[PDB]
Design a protein around this ligand. Structure first.
Ligand SMILES: NC(=O)C1=CN([C@@H]2O[C@H](COP(=O)(O)OP(=O)(O)OC[C@H]3O[C@@H](n4cnc5c(N)ncnc54)[C@H](OP(=O)(O)O)[C@@H]3O)[C@@H](O)[C@H]2O)C=CC1
Ligand SMILES: CCCCCCCCCCCC(=O)OC[C@H](COP(=O)(O)OCC[N+](C)(C)C)OC(=O)CCCCCCCCCCC
Lengths: 78, 359
């Protein structure tokens, strides 16, 4: 609970000490906070790019895997 | 200074008073004068007052701030430095500081208009009242200080009012008055340098591209002292400036490099490119919200105007003094703000100046 009290002081001292640097790191922080608020889909797609290149099981691959299982089982009944 | 400032022990003023100086020029010596230094509590006054008192001239210093006049009494002996409370709107208090005065010096001059005074009301209204009132009391000599770029027709408020200040005095005090134009002086807590040392200087590129002819404030302090004791220098116009030409942006990087101030200049706020409307808007907004004198709209225009030498005026050598260069004194006056200290000598300022100009 100590940071909640110390947060008002340090944020003030971040803009006073390094005003140009403060306007970016705080400004950049608000972008991603807004991005998740507004479902911009950016950080999600930056994430999906990494999982594709590094061979991870992506979200799209699982849903494609379900389609292959779904399409196979349905024709098995016929 | 040296040992005794007066050229001759007995000096007769324009009013017929015969003043005899006594002593060998020490603190306990006298000169028989009474130099009222208006605006003595300011940056320039504290040098004008100091030199006059140590050599035995009575100084009457009219003040409006009570706690700033205390330190002026150290310079003189007992009774040498006198005080009068006044305001430019109180005519009677003006006549208290000129009744016994044989020398009257005018230093009052502002760059920012306040909720009680405008730029004209001080560079003219104060000067006109001060000059005219001094004459009626038989003051022998008047000395005045104006801008270094006085011009009656200039679009800058400071330069326009300061120029009219020259005319309105000579229509009030008369032919005896003298006008001295000082270039931006540099000294301890100099307003000329205090803008260069400030880390958060918004519009630093725009403000510092102006050009100047910096002059050592001590010499101007003695320049008035030389003029004060001489009657040969009535009715003249003097412009005092330094030989080597310097620009603020040349100084600002030269100043910063001595203080050694990688990533820091890009972050702390050394270079703040801001739009021209924003600078104009910011100065206007603070003009109604601030309580201390900030950057003004007038200094936004002055930044586009370079210093001009007027050939009708007279230089330092007219008084027998050789002006000193900013190179020999720039380091020591920022030495407060700076393993093994590197002392940037007179010649080595050029080598610093070389390093600034090299891209
Ligand atoms: N190197 C420099 O400083 C520069 C010199 N000049 C000019 O030389 C002149 C000397 O001024 P300087 O000392 O250098 O700087 P300052 O502004 O500090 O001098 C101001 C002096 O005049 C007084 N003053 C201003 N307005 C009023 C007013 N309404 N009523 C009474 N007194 C007032 C001040 O009183 P107080 O301080 O007690 O309130 C102070 O004594 C100025 O006109 C200046 O513009 C030109 C460019 C720069
Ligand atoms: C915190 C807000 C500060 C308000 C300052 C102010 O009200 O100032 C507004 C004006 C300006 O006058 P000044 O500041 O002396 O101008 C000189 C300083 N400059 C050159 C930087 C502008 O004055 C007034 O009308 C004062 C009315 C008193 C209001 C109550 C306080």
């Amino acid at each position: 609970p100590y940071l909640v009290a110390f947060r008002p002081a340090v944020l003030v001292f971040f803009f006073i000490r390094q005003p140009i640097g403060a306007g970016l790191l705080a400004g950049g922080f608000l972008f991603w906070q807004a991005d998740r608020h507004f479902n911009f889909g950016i950080r999600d797609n930056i994430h999906n790019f990494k999982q594709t290149i590094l061979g991870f099981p992506t979200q799209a691959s699982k849903w494609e895997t379900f389609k292959q299982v779904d399409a196979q089982k349905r024709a098995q009944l016929v | 200074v040296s040992t005794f400032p007066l050229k001759s022990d007995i000096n007769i003023t324009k009013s017929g008073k015969t003043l005899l100086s006594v002593g060998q020029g020490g603190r306990s010596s006298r000169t028989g004068f009474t130099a009222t230094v208006f605006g003595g509590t300011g940056f320039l006054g504290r040098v004008v007052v100091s030199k006059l008192a140590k050599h035995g001239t009575n100084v009457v210093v009219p003040f409006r701030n009570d706690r700033a006049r205390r330190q002026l009494k150290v310079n003189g002996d007992l009774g040498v430095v006198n005080f009068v409370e006044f305001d430019i709107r109180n005519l009677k208090s003006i006549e208290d500081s000129v009744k016994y005065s044989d020398i009257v010096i005018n230093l009052i001059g502002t760059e920012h208009f306040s909720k009680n005074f405008s730029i004209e009301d001080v560079n003219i209204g104060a000067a006109e009242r001060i000059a005219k009132a001094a004459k009626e009391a038989g003051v022998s000599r008047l000395i005045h200080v104006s801008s270094y770029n006085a011009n009656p027709s200039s679009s800058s408020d400071f330069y326009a009012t300061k120029g009219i200040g020259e005319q309105v005095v000579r229509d009030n005090f008369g032919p005896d008055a003298t006008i001295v134009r000082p270039a931006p002086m540099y000294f301890r807590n100099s307003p000329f340098l205090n803008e260069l040392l400030q880390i958060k200087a918004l519009g630093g590129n725009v403000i510092f591209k102006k050009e100047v002819y910096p002059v050592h404030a001590l010499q101007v302090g003695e320049a008035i002292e030389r003029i004060a004791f001489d009657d040969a220098t009535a009715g003249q116009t003097y412009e005092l400036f330094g030989k080597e030409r310097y620009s603020k942006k040349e100084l600002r990087e030269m100043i910063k490099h001595i203080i050694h101030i990688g990533y820091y200049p890009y972050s702390a706020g050394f270079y703040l490119p801001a739009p021209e409307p924003f600078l104009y808007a910011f100065a206007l907004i603070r003009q109604y919200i601030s309580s201390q004198p900030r950057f003004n709209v007038d200094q936004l225009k002055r930044s586009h105007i370079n210093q001009e030498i007027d050939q009708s005026a007279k230089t330092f050598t007219d008084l027998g003094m050789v002006p000193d260069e900013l190179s020999e004194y720039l380091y020591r006056y920022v030495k407060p703000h700076i393993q093994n200290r590197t002392v940037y000598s007179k010649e080595d300022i050029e080598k610093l100046r070389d390093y600034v100009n090299t891209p």
